[PDB]
Point group: C2
Chain length 224, copies 2
């Protein structure tokens, strides 16, 4: 019905930021013509959300839409990982999204880290959705202390979902991790049948309580 | 309304060094029959902070377990949490949330502040930020509606303020809808920048909660302040 595609000309910025040029493709492939609205937005660390392209309505009367849109990422924005999202909502309510990530001030293919303490938190089996009748999704957590000295860390997780829900996934834990050691666990969330349908962001936070620096890791699961 | 939830905090104002907040949680069954539900207490704060009220000494292995209340009866529990110094100064929302077995959601929220005054506008060092749902429209019909917001930035500094401003609506299905494009304003000392910007919720947008999120940046100091307001599409 609609196929959305997003390409970024570049994916890695230095700490001072820079310019990213986006190529947007929206294809109406089906037999019927289609009306939709679309826009381009960015999500980043520290609760940053910002627009790159305003809401525009399109009636494919179908064609193929190709648009280039760039945006500046200023130095003041936090170093870390950002997600650019081309979003389309069709007249019938169907939602289509094409996302791409860029990083600022950190390496694209490295684990997030707090000055030598690396944070490896993953959706263990890559389960991106669960049935409306319920399902369970396990996550792996590995905090590896690559420093010469000990790391004093705090860790927790919530599920930020529909209807303003913020569901606890992992209570606040505190660990003193020796040099060279790793804190490892697997933690799952059971999505009970009663939880509302929609998108949940599994939000993991790790803090070095000595430096006071905090790193967040966000992972999406949809309940159908 | 099967369930009635209530929350109170023992204090609503912390210094920048943080502190300890005790909460009183009340969940009453108003229905004529037994109700089964799950409930939890969570906190949302500045800089994208979200955290659960619970802290454990070792490894958290607990499940989110259901409770039940027979006709007329009530659950009263107390929960406390530490707000560490490292957490950003600003406004926090504590939310008691209840999900009944039937899928119905009930919430009771209270706010506290850390390192800022309780009854004062959000501010960037003398530049105050006053952003409001203009007519107090908290929801729109599933068939669509429009909600205007007032924006007033008062520069109480001695020199001019250089700011960047934008708004989005963070909604269901991972939507982040542009509301106000990124603009840069130069505001003289003593002046107020005022505008009105609204968002049209098209009929086609998904039902559920939208957080209208306004962000203001002092582009000289690099400091950023957010203001979040909720609109529900039925
Ligand atoms: Cl205290």
């Amino acid at each position: 019905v609609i196929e959305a595609n997003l390409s970024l000309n570049q994916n890695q910025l230095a700490s001072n930021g820079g310019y990213i040029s986006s190529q947007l493709g929206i294809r109406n492939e089906s037999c019927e013509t289609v009306k939709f609205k679309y826009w381009l937005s960015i999500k980043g660390p520290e609760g940053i959300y910002f627009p790159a392209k305003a809401v525009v309505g399109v009636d494919t009367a179908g064609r193929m839409l190709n648009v280039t849109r760039g945006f500046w990422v200023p130095e003041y924005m936090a170093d870390g990982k950002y997600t650019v999202s081309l979003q389309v909502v069709a007249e019938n309510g169907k939602v289509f999204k094409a996302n791409q990530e860029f990083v600022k001030g950190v390496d694209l293919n490295s684990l997030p880290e707090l000055n030598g303490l690396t944070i490896d938190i993953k959706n263990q089996f890559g389960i991106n959705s669960v049935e409306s009748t319920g399902g369970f999704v396990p996550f792996t957590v590995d905090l590896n202390n690559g420093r010469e000295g000990e790391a004093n860390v705090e860790f927790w997780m919530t599920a930020v979902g529909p209807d303003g829900l913020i569901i606890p996934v992992n209570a606040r834990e505190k660990w003193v991790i020796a040099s060279g050691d790793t804190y490892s666990k697997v933690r799952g969330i059971n999505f009970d049948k009663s939880y509302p349908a929609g998108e949940y962001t599994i939000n993991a936070q790790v803090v070095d309580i000595v430096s006071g620096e905090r790193v967040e890791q966000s992972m999406t699961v949809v309940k159908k």
